[PDB]
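Ligand: 2'-deoxyadenosine 5'-triphosphate. Inputs:
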Amino acid sequence: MIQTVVKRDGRIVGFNEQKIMAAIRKAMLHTDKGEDTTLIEQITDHISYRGKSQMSVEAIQDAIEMELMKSARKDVAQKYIAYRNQRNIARKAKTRDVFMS
Amino acid sequence: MIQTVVKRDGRIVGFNEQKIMAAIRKAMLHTDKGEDTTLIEQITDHISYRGKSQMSVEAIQDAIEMELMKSARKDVAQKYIAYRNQRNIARKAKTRDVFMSIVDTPAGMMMKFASETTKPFVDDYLLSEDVRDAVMHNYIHIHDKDYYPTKSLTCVQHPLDVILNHGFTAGHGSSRPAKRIETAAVLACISLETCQNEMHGGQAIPAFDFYLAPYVRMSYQEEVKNLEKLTGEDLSNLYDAPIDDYIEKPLDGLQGRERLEQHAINKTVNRVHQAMEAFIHNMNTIHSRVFSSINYGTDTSAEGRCIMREILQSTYQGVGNGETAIFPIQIWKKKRGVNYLPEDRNYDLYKLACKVTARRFFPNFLNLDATFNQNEKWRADDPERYKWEIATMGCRTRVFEDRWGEKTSIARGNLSFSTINIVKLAIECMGIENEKQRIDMFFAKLDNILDITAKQLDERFQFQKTAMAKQFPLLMKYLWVGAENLKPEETIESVINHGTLGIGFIGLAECLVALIGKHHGESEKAQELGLKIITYMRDRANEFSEQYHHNYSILATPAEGLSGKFTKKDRKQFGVIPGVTDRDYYTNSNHVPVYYKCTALKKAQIEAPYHDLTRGGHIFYVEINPSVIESVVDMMDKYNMGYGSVN
Ligand SMILES: Nc1ncnc2c1ncn2[C@H]1C[C@H](O)[C@@H](COP(=O)(O)OP(=O)(O)OP(=O)(O)O)O1
Ligand SMILES: Nc1ncnc2c1ncn2[C@H]1C[C@H](O)[C@@H](COP(=O)(O)OP(=O)(O)OP(=O)(O)O)O1
Ligand SMILES: Nc1ncnc2c1ncn2[C@H]1C[C@H](O)[C@@H](COP(=O)(O)OP(=O)(O)OP(=O)(O)O)O1
Ligand SMILES: Nc1ncnc2c1ncn2[C@H]1C[C@H](O)[C@@H](COP(=O)(O)OP(=O)(O)OP(=O)(O)O)O1
Ligand SMILES: Nc1ncnc2c1ncn2[C@H]1C[C@H](O)[C@@H](COP(=O)(O)OP(=O)(O)OP(=O)(O)O)O1
Ligand SMILES: [Mg+2]
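Predicted complex:
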């Protein structure tokens, strides 16, 4: 398993194992079917190996993608790669560089 | 196979296999490794055999993505499901407002962008942990949260004389003093609309009579000079000639030196008349293009009456082709000894004011003799009485008392205010059945929420200070108490304390229903609790004022930005309850609910004590001949009513 996560800004924090179950649960609400908790738990637990004890948030969100594209719920998969792309364009704004000015 | 595809617009075309192929090719050509026809052929053949006779573009793309997922090359789908979505958003922005969902005139759209960008950053990086926790669960509301990074203040009361007397210089713009009526209202408007950019609230001009009063004499003198330039006479004693009132009557029926003294007054009255309608039109158009307020009604000279009559006539007529102007907001001052009783000097102006208010809904009325507005320095002989007369704003705000300064409302303002949700606490405590324990729990929680609100207000204050003078070119050089002593680059920490902090409340009747079967306006026992809770809040406000070295007051919020922001989030969490979360309003601070049939007398009786208790702001709103408003004003005088707005 893993403990260290290096967020986008550059800080280091500890693994929580519960946030993932929120991200892979909010998407399934906008999908015409609220998937049973069994798949949430299975996918969450399947991120135990394949780690390195330190992985960036980009890696942990670019790996959960290639796990809903297999679990017979691609309906959820379609409405997960769209939201991420939406929010990766807003982050390019030079906004947090003005407040801290 | 597939033979007909229905385009998005609606056309029907034939199935061409060379278009499902180039699309995947372009998707593949940006994914490091870029493959050849080996998989393209498989995907296209699979699609074009399992389908129906006729298909749509969206269905075909669904099939493309579904097959591109169930493959070995999954790096080509993640560049498909993104480009398609970007194109959807682009083609949806030709008739809708997609750019707002992610986060009509151009200026309004830009302001919406800025507000939405600013709000979450403040909600995260600036507040503290306890305050943030309180805000998240719908316990309080911070008014005007989007201007937090700009160390901004709410409102002020303009000392309009300091600019008319001398010249004012802002940026590269400079202006000399005034020398007639037309060049005075224009400067008043300039200074009234120049300070909006420096503040996030309303604007007010107190003593609308005295400040412009010296400027009805100058035009008279100039007209006399012009009427004695040609005639060769020496009308040198007409300058400071005492006058009774600047009334105008026809001219034919005299001759000689008594004919060239009624004409001058006529031209002067017309000159003063045009200017006031120009003022009203300017302030009315600026809004659509800016809250404003003007106070008058306690000047017993000859020029003040002229100004009052001119403004009243212009407002009564209307604007344009007879429409009712929305701004400026006009407020009429009533005192017992100046304009109330039949023997008083300004009875006629009062009657005219009632006549106009019976139609165009302005001016409002402010009791200048209430038990909590009286001042012990108002001298009827001083030429500077206005310094000791309370003034109010269109937002229902009051700034009179002071623990470290004089008791005036000139050159002072408000700095922030936050409202507190009270219905939620009562609903939450509704669980237990025993009556006494419910009240005990209510009082137990109210104290903690009040402490959190006070801490938030103080932190806001601590942040607002540290603002350099140059950030506010006009407010901190001519229109604040300590100006004329501050260098361009000095902080404003030495003058900020001459301000006020408000704690508002909303929806008391619902809070009563959650602890008894009737609200304040239906059962005698009900009001004994509303009075008690308001009293508790006032006492805690006094304690906080003593603790933190600031000024704190209780407030009835104007209900302009927070009308349903609380009830919706409360129905969802707790669900429908009869008469508490079933109307989509939450009633105002302490009024009687609009859906309960009640008369003026009973409402006034139940409301006046709260007016006494809420120093930071209060109202008494009643919805309906000039004799009708007289009953309202008399009702205000009979009890300790402060600010009425019947219209
Ligand atoms: N401790 C963690 N370990 C691994 N991945 C994490 C962790 N915390 C968050 N993530 C990743 C995967 C989760 O699906 C997703 C949760 O939200 P996240 O992207 O961290 O939000 P955020 O940091 O942009 O915002 P917020 O401050 O609102 O939580 O982020
Ligand atoms: N309603 C939803 N629909 C689709 N995806 C969702 C939804 N709610 C959450 N998600 C996804 C998006 C992210 O992967 C994760 C939630 O993190 P979120 O804060 O929304 O994204 P983010 O890390 O891109 O944020 P930001 O860039 O704003 O800090 O779950
Ligand atoms: N002739 C066609 N036969 C089958 N599918 C088609 C055809 N034309 C378009 N499609 C479907 C499948 C393609 O994956 C998807 C994208 O087509 P594309 O040519 O990019 O858009 P379009 O035909 O609406 O017009 P445009 O030239 O503006 O792109 O549309
Ligand atoms: N640069 C690209 N990166 C990834 N995939 C792409 C790219 N360009 C095209 N594609 C793929 C995904 C698109 O759904 C498909 C059709 O492209 P295109 O004809 O430009 O779009 P479209 O017909 O949906 O848009 P439009 O609204 O302009 O008609 O080709
Ligand atoms: N709309 C306006 N906005 C700003 N400044 C204005 C505006 N209109 C006029 N001014 C200037 C002109 C003068 O500088 C000052 C008003 O002075 P005023 O009393 O009208 O006459 P004056 O001093 O120019 O007259 P004189 O020519 O007799 O010297 O404001
Ligand atoms: Mg005219």
